[PDB]
């Protein structure tokens, strides 16, 4: 029978929908989340198509010599005011199933921004999107429960800032940050902390903590961009990078 032969070929055609670089990434962030849960509680290579399908998130490797790679690499490094050595390893286009249709692009002032996260959050971030934190209300609100601009989703325009939240993973020591389209809308500039915010001030859609300078002192070392609605955010790229300062 040739119906037998046709189904084995269809298996091959299904498996190849996952590239090698994306399959590697899926296993690493999956290894990192499992390794982290295991550690909380004590205790080439075949395709990991089941793990990738469970992310419900499309991931395409962008090749190191293409126009897209060199441009997006450039944009990531554009505001690296630390001048600390960074090796942009890999770049991935990312697409969540519902993110593209719920995005509030019509607010205007859409900017691409950086969001750093530890590696063990990445599987959850790809499956669910960036989520709002839970607001504290039954006990006193503490500064370990709240960003310095309240209960929102935090971005920066600077790779120097993102490096403070993209910690090296225990698996392979590399760092991940996200590049997101953020619908900033009417963006209010702030020079002082405000832990109590749960939405942008009246008439504004987002908030900007202005980074301190010699002329203008502020409460913010870094530039922070904060939105308070998950649909003001659309993930676009995953960036894998490393820092040699990190070795030895
Ligand atoms: N996160 C950043 O890249 C930046 C953070 N900041 C600074 O950091 C503070 C806020 O730190 P954050 O870690 O951003 O916020 P946070 O203290 O509210 O922590 C929430 C964490 O949950 C993660 N997360 C969000 N949705 C998730 C999901 N669906 N699954 C799994 N994990 C998910 C985020 O990556 C984030 O690290 C601010 O006070 C400011 O000083 C400001 C600029 C950029």
Numbering used by the authors: 316 to 358, 367 to 571
From the reporting publication:
PARP4 is an ADP-ribosyltransferase that resides within the vault ribonucleoprotein organelle. PARP4 is an ADP-ribosyltransferase that uses NAD+ as a substrate to synthesize ADP-ribose modifications on molecules. The PARP1-homology region of PARP4 includes a BRCT fold, a WGR domain, and the catalytic (CAT) domain. However, PARP3 and PARP4 contain the catalytic triad H-Y-E but are considered MARylation enzymes, indicating that other structural features are important determinants of catalytic output.
We also determined structures of the PARP4 ART domain alone (CATΔHD), which provided higher-resolution insights into the active site configuration that gives rise to PARP4 mono(ADP-ribosylation) activity. The HD was replaced with an 8-residue linker (GSGSGSGG) connecting L282 to S365. CATΔHD crystallized in complex with EB47, and in complex with NADH, the non-hydrolysable reduced form of NAD+. The CATΔHD/NADH crystals diffracted to 2.55 Å and belong to space group C2221 with three PARP4 molecules in the asymmetric unit. The structure was determined by molecular replacement using a truncated version of the PARP4 CAT/EB47 structure with the ligand removed. Two PARP4 molecules had NADH in their active sites, whereas the active site of the third molecule was empty due to a nearby crystal contact. The structure was refined to a crystallographic R/RFREE of 0.211/0.254. The structure of the PARP4 ART domain bound to NADH was compared to the closely related ART domains of PARP1, PARP2 and PARP3 in order to investigate the structural basis for the MARylation activity of PARP4. In the acceptor site, main chain atoms from residues L985 and Y986 in PARP1 interact with the α-phosphate of ADP, and the equivalent residues E544 and D545 of PARP4 are positioned such that they would clash with both the α- and β-phosphates. We thus conclude that PARP4 does not maintain a functional acceptor site as defined by the chicken PARP1 structure.
